[PDB]
Write a protein that binds this DNA or RNA. Structure first.
Length: 577
DNA sequence: CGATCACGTA
DNA sequence: ACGTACGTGATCGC
């Protein structure tokens, strides 16, 4: 049972509690809190939020760092409270992050899923309580109050067994010193948001709209017929049946029209270059103009992403609503989108700092490959050096094509090398790709030993680990299906690299936040994009940031090779180049 | 409403 | 025979 409380009392304010601050909307920015539950040594309490959040003693308790709270997804609560002007402190255990670290593959998205990992089932999945999609709703108070108290009771019961397993895994510091402090930093970044120049975005959409109309009219006259260019089915009929273009790859239902396939078809018809261009413009228009404008806040003109900290299988963050980790940059036309991302205050600038080749530097460290470590100790161009070694030429004899192919080898090595995967990427035969791979391992025998050993270790232990002891279980490493087993082998090779790189930048973020506070800088973190950090700061702080930010990022961990950070700043995200 | 294509990023 | 890890939008089916 539990107390359905009319007022906040002293016994609800104990120095250790499980706390539920329920935000049902999936995007929690400026979202309602629908109910609160507190479980502690004195009992179990449900509080209505309009009462609790107006009570100065409850607000003081929330913000008291010495009053310890155990929660699930405390960032969601912390951010929803920030929009109400209320500080949440003292979160000493986050069951979402604890479950994520123990096993990211569970996809633990609610308390019930985490509870099931320890044979605790006296709590309902959130989706069973609130419903799915269209029929999603907050239930009546008796039903809501029981759910929130059951969630708090589950958190109360599950802290000890989760912490015990984290300790056995040597992941306790990973939770308490990395992921939990990072959660507070992400909460601040999301709450700050990024300012958008919506007038510039709208002007870009207008120009894109004209150019789409121009290319689309060109495609129709080249096909002698109007059709929905955005339908892969209609497009496949036009290309491979009407225009009789060669079919070099079929999908499941019909024909493949992916950009790769289209590159090869461009010699046969002028329509193919136009379809590629039409796809480029339509992607910018639908996803990065129209889509961005849909989630810009009309009052502040800011976007407030949500960084999912407990989703990826490697320890990376992801970013949603909007995804600010896939804003175009590779092609100049899309890169101009970044001109619409601007500082949030006048006389401020965008500052962007990125690790140089962090994945291959991590590989050099974990493989202890003499040649690879020496290449980074010389700060060589790694792809040119790889071409020199693979193709047995001096630096002067590396042609652009040779560097391009060596780069592709380097990407395959990080991803989990295979002759078929490299052959697909370089448009060469499997036998040729195998020759490249054999030459690579002759030049980097420590990497070869590492890759063999990590696959065997994944088989023996059942999992692989990162530098800071994140883990990923790989049960498919023992499969007798070649495809399934090969997937797991590539994951064994890639996850310690991608995951260790994630560990490093997460530590850098914690270290940076602490240095910014010590220095009393106004500069603030806005975004992380896997190997880069984006900040905004007064123009008068740029000189100090040019020294501080790369140093903090470079010193976040000590590896057998240096870490190298490049940086740029300017009046928009585009200009921070 | 739900997988599939496709394409954007590191 | 599949490159590693993500998210969004569109089409198309029931």
């Amino acid at each position: 049972a539990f107390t359905l409380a009319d007022r906040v009392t002293e016994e609800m304010l104990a120095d250790k509690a499980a706390l539920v601050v329920e935000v049902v909307e999936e995007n929690y920015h400026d979202a309602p809190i629908v109910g609160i539950a507190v479980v502690n040594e004195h009992g179990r309490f449900f509080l209505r939020p309009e009462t609790a959040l107006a009570d100065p003693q409850f607000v003081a308790w929330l913000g008291d760092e010495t009053k310890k709270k155990s929660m699930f997804d405390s960032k969601r609560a912390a951010v929803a409270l920030k929009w109400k002007g209320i500080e949440l402190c003292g979160v000493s255990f986050d069951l979402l992050l604890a479950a994520y670290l123990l096993d990211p593959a569970q996809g633990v998205d609610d308390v019930a899923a985490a509870a099931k990992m320890k044979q605790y089932e006296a709590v309902r999945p959130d989706e069973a309580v609130y419903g799915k999609g269209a029929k999603r709703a907050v239930p009546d108070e008796p039903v809501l109050a029981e759910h929130l108290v059951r969630k708090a009771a589950a958190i109360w019961a599950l802290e000890r067994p989760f912490l015990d397993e984290l300790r056995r895994n040597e992941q306790d510091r990973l939770l308490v010193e990395l992921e939990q402090p990072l959660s507070s930093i992400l909460a601040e970044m999301e709450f700050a948001g990024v300012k958008v120049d919506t007038k510039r975005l709208e002007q870009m959409g207008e120009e894109l709209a004209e150019q789409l109309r121009t290319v689309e009219q060109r495609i129709y006259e080249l096909a002698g017929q109007e059709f929905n260019i955005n339908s892969p089915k209609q497009l496949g009929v036009i290309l491979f049946e009407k225009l009789q273009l060669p079919v070099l790859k079929k999908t499941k239902t019909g024909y493949s029209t992916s950009a790769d396939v289209l590159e090869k078809l461009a010699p046969y018809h002028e329509i193919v270059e136009n379809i590629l261009h039409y796809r480029q413009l339509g992607k910018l228009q639908s996803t990065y103009i129209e889509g961005l404008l849909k989630v810009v806040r009309p009052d502040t003109k800011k976007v407030h992403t949500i960084f999912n900290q407990a989703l990826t299988q490697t320890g990376r963050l992801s970013s949603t609503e909007p995804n600010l980790q896939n804003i175009p940059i590779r092609l100049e036309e899309g890169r101009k989108i970044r001109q619409a991302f601007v500082p949030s205050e006048s006389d401020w600038l965008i500052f962007a700092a990125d690790y140089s080749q962090i994945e291959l530097r991590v590989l050099a460290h974990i493989a202890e490959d003499d040649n690879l470590m020496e290449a980074f100790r010389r700060d060589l161009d790694i792809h040119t050096k790889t071409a020199m070694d693979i193709f047995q030429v001096s630096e002067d004899e590396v042609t652009p094509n040779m560097r391009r192919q060596a780069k592709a080898v380097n990407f395959g090595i990080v991803y989990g090398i295979s002759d078929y995967g490299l052959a697909q990427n370089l448009n060469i035969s499997r036998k040729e790709a195998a020759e490249f791979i054999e030459r690579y391992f002759e030049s980097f025998p420590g990497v070869k030993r590492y890759m063999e050993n990590i696959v065997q270790e994944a088989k023996q232990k059942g999992y692989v680990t990162t530098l800071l002891h994140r883990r990923r279980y790989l049960p498919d490493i023992t499969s007798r299906n070649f495809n399934v087993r090969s997937f797991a082998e590539r994951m064994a090779m890639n996850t310690p690299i991608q995951g260790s790189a994630a560990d490093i930048i997460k530590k850098a973020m914690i270290d940076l936040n602490a240095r910014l506070k010590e220095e009393r800088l106004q500069a603030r973190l806005l975004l992380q994009v896997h190997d880069e950090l984006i900040l905004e700061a007064p123009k008068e702080e740029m000189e100090r940031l040019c020294r501080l930010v790369p140093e903090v990022m470079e010193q976040a961990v000590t590896l057998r090779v240096p870490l190298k950070v490049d940086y740029h700043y300017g009046s928009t995200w585009y200009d921070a180049k």
